[PDB]
């Protein structure tokens, strides 16, 4: 009973969009979500498909499906069952905030003193980044977004020609050139390579997260790091 009604509920959600795209492209519900404005496919499924299955507080699923959507109108039994998820959302709100707020305070606390105070600490170490690993075909998307804005710790060569110099910001053009050719090793300067745990330099940090260029002296990157992680909690 659980799995037959979960498969039925999930099949309605899959066919909801092609039904909208082929037969009613300008349907208001479709446009309000397909354009990315307000609402996702899950919430529209609650309105035009079926609410599916709920779960009792102790993890287990209820052996009775909600086979009606909000337009049709839930039965008295279905409405009571749907109140299980309503109680969870309000209760889980009271713990998502009190925990993430505590987590954010500790995150800001540990790195509050980290400020860009030097132009170059003078380090020679560099974290090695490799595109090819014989255990998995690397996804080029991850290989790019991590490397953008990093400062090279060593020169990169293609044959007898230098294509990227030490202490040079890694643009997206260089990364694609590295991927296009067989460059197996990239050495970058990261916060792990700075010669200090009380401050960081401009080169070991990299490009500014908002200002486009290299990070500027006197920037409180530690608090920005703490806020950036705790904010989506």
């Amino acid at each position: 009973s659980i799995e037959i009604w979960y498969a039925t509920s999930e099949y309605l959600r899959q066919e909801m969009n092609p039904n909208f795209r082929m037969t009613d492209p300008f349907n208001p519900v479709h446009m309000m979500s397909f354009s990315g404005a307000r609402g996702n496919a899950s919430q529209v499924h609650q309105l035009v498909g079926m609410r599916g299955l709920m779960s009792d507080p102790q993890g287990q699923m209820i052996d009775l499906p909600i086979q009606s959507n909000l337009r049709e109108g839930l039965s008295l039994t279905e409405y009571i069952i749907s109140c299980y998820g309503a109680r969870k959302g309000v209760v889980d709100t009271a713990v998502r905030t009190s925990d993430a707020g505590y987590l954010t305070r500790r995150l800001v606390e540990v790195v509050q003193h980290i400020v860009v105070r030097r132009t170059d600490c003078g380090t020679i170490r560099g974290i090695s980044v490799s595109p090819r690993n014989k255990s998995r075909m690397m996804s080029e998307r991850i290989f790019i977004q991590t490397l953008i804005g990093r400062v090279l710790a060593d020169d990169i060569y293609i044959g007898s020609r230098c294509v990227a110099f030490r202490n040079q910001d890694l643009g997206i053009g260089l990364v694609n050139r590295f991927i296009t050719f067989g460059t197996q090793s990239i050495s970058i300067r990261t916060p792990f390579t700075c010669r200090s745990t009380s401050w960081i330099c401009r080169l070991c940090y990299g490009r500014s997260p908002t200002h486009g260029d290299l990070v500027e002296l006197g920037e409180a990157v530690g608090i920005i790091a703490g806020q950036s992680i705790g904010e989506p909690g």
């Binding site: 560099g126 090695s128 050495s187």
Partner: peptide
Amino acid sequence: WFPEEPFEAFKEMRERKVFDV
């Protein structure tokens, strides 16, 4: 992962430029 074998780990650190002679 750095391999559990100590000498394989040393060779990995040499290849990954973590540490060298």
